[PDB]
Structure 1
Amino acid sequence: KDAWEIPRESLRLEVKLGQGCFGEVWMGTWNGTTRVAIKTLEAFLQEAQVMKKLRHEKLVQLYAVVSEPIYIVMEYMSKGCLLDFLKGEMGKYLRLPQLVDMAAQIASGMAYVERMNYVHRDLRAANILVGENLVCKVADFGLARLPIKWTAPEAALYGRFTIKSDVWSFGILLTELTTKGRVPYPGMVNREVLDQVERGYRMPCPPECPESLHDLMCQCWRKDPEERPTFEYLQAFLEDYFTSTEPQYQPGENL
């Protein structure tokens, strides 16, 4: 029992948050003082194992872990899921500068993962958590080492997960951001996407999305994993976007 392990008695589970399909997600308090977010249910726990080796400000942080009834105490993200955020009420008001900045922060969390020689493998809006001040953090490392509409073709087909398949997924994440959370490849079933993506099909520029940002998406979707940008490049590109790339940006109806 390593030094991440706590007494369950130190926890006060409080509010179901909290969907809810692989076990549960609760709000809580830890050691009476700390506002945390628990996570109920054996190796599951794989997520906790990897979040022991990772620590970055744009990755939701492991606090503590348990046995069942196995809990994973973690940083509390007050705004929940990004997917919900984007399609909920606080979604119609988000424009390009907010959304690009959200992109920037996810790229920063993913740039760290990249430095650390990890692969996330399940990178998408559902797996980004939002807090106050529009802070976005990469969550749900359950599948991380050392769904196909977000999965690079080579990884979906031959199980070839690399940082570069995360990049692909990032490109699809960018479309979720730019469309307020719409499912990628509108009106396409899983099999039609695989076959079409194999044939060279890529999603078009979202309405109101500048061509410079869709090009970035297309870079992330290059057939050739190794020809896709790094996260360090995407972080920097997104951070500087409004000066270096679209300094003539004017708001529109939706972006």
Structure 2
Amino acid sequence: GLGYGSWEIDPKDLTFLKELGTGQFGVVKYGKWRGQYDVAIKMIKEGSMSEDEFIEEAKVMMNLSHEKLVQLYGVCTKQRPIFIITEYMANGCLLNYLREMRHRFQTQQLLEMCKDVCEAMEYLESKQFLHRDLAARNCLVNDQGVVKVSDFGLSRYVLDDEYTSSVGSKFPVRWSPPEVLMYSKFSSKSDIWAFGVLMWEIYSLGKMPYERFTNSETAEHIAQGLRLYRPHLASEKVYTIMYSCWHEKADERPTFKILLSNILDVMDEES
């Protein structure tokens, strides 16, 4: 209460239960808030984040709410490392989930995963909010198998310069359109391109895009107009959708609303 804004959680209300893994900002734990509510607790490693800028942005993120978006519940700011408190996603990151062959996915389940993400992205686009680093590694899966988009916008606060421009060794080259790699031109349409690569990741059961290429080679391939090709599990109609995200001209790429319509049509035709 006293001492806390609407965006601030009291860390004393947290009970820590299990480790969930380690990501861009360090370790993530599963816990409860006020004894009952499941939460994930991202513990932000010292020196990793532009914390004041992130905290100001968290106030904006508190107002993003969609069933296919991992919900931000608040932040613990008064602290050693600061915490980000979010919705708990018991089945972990999508990339790893796709790679577990025991699931024996049907293609209708793969298309549903694409739809889940596309709905979240259509919501973000309706708010004029870019993800800026969409990829399977940044999607999460709940106990019901629903995929949700996470960490939206957070790349803006990463202090490790290896991540933050193409000149960096950890930049998401394989998820970037030509205008990002050539000129650093980010837009809705760079999220669209990344979404198409994400559909490729889903239909490829978690393969690395351009698996036989380095990042440098990938950039040369794409900037010469060449592309990923059709995963074996994708129908022609699904392939057409992902491929439409990769138009050399950003303005000729679809919106998320259009992509959603196309996905629904294929779900109806393939059902």
For normalisation by structure 1, the TM-score amounts to 0.90
Pairwise CA RMSD: 1.8
Contact map agreement 1:48 1:72 (CA 8 A) in 2:
no
Which residues of 2 match residues 10-89 of structure 1 at below 5 A?
10-41=13-44, 43-44=50-51, 45=54, 48-67=58-77, 68-89=80-101
Q: 1:49 to 1:152 in 2, by over 3 A?
A: farther
Contact map agreement 1:50 1:144 (CA 8 A) in 2:
no
AA of the residue aligned to 2:41: I
AA of the residue aligned to 2:98: L
1:214 and 2:236 equivalent? Answer: no
Contact map agreement 2:140 2:147 (CA 8 A) in 1:
yes
CA deviations on 1:199-234 (whole Å, 9 max, x unpaired) are 110111112421111111211000111110111111
Contact map agreement 1:118 1:144 (CA 8 A) in 2:
no
AA of the residue aligned to 1:153: P
Could you tell me which runs of 5 or more consecutive residues in structure 1 were left unpaired when the two chains were aligned: 248-255
Q: Which of 1, 5, 9 is 1:6 aligned to?
A: 9
AA of the residue aligned to 2:110: L
Could you tell me which runs of 5 or more consecutive residues in structure 2 were left unpaired when the two chains were aligned: 158-171
AA of the residue aligned to 2:123: Y
1:231 and 2:256 equivalent? Answer: yes
CA deviations on 1:106-152 (whole Å, 9 max, x unpaired) are 0000000110011111101000110122211100121269x110111
Task: For residue 20 of structure 1, report the CA deviation from its aligned partner.
Answer: 4.2
> Matches of 1:21 and 1:64 in 2, distance apart?
18
Once the two structures are aligned, what percentage of the paired residues are identical? Answer: 39
Between the two proteins, the alignment pairs up a number of residues equal to 244
Question: Per the alignment, in what secondary structure is the counterpart of residue 175 of structure 2?
Answer: coil
Q: 1:14 to 1:133 in 2, by over 3 A?
A: closer
Partner of 1:250: none
Question: Per the alignment, in what secondary structure is the counterpart of residue 24 of structure 1?
Answer: strand
Q: 1:218 to 1:89 in 2, by over 3 A?
A: closer
Task: For residue 12 of structure 1, report the CA deviation from its aligned partner.
Answer: 1.1
> Matches of 1:63 and 1:5 in 2, distance apart?
9
Ranges of 4+ aligned residues in structure 1 off by more than 4 Å: none
CA deviations on 1:33-59 (whole Å, 9 max, x unpaired) are 111111001534367355223111111
Q: Which of 229, 238, 253 is 1:204 aligned to?
A: 229
Q: 1:50 to 1:192 in 2, by over 3 A?
A: farther
> Matches of 1:87 and 1:174 in 2, distance apart?
14
> Matches of 1:89 and 1:212 in 2, distance apart?
24
Q: Which of 177, 183, 191 is 1:152 aligned to?
A: 177
> Matches of 2:83 and 2:199 in 1, distance apart?
32
1:183 and 2:208 equivalent? Answer: yes
CA deviations on 1:153-174 (whole Å, 9 max, x unpaired) are 2123212111110010011001
Q: Which of 126, 131, 135 is 2:146 aligned to?
A: 135
> Matches of 1:29 and 1:51 in 2, distance apart?
21
Question: Per the alignment, in what secondary structure is the counterpart of residue 56 of structure 1?
Answer: coil
> Matches of 1:86 and 1:2 in 2, distance apart?
39
> Matches of 2:60 and 2:178 in 1, distance apart?
25
